[PDB]
Design a protein around this ligand. Structure first.
Ligand SMILES: CCNC(=O)c1cc(C(=O)NCC)cc(C(=O)NCC)c1
Lengths: 24, 25, 24
């Protein structure tokens, strides 16, 4: 399914969309 | 959601689009 | 299709899921 549409980037983890910024 | 470009570059999902990872690194 | 479900983040590249950590 689609990631949130909220001006933030997402990566795929554990069957979820997780913010990229958390890893940066 | 559709495939990302297949062009040797990594993409992340943003705003219902595929965006280059490199932009954020 | 789904990325691996293994506690790790993935990005999309070349029609595949590739570890985010490789790029960081
Ligand atoms: C210009 C913003 N770039 C990043 O924040 C960035 C880039 C990189 C990056 O370019 N890595 C290439 C080795 C890595 C990280 C990272 O490992 N953050 C952990 C807190 C962050």
């Amino acid at each position: 399914p689609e990631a949130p549409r909220d001006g933030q980037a997402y990566v795929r983890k554990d069957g979820e969309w997780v913010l990229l910024s958390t890893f940066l």
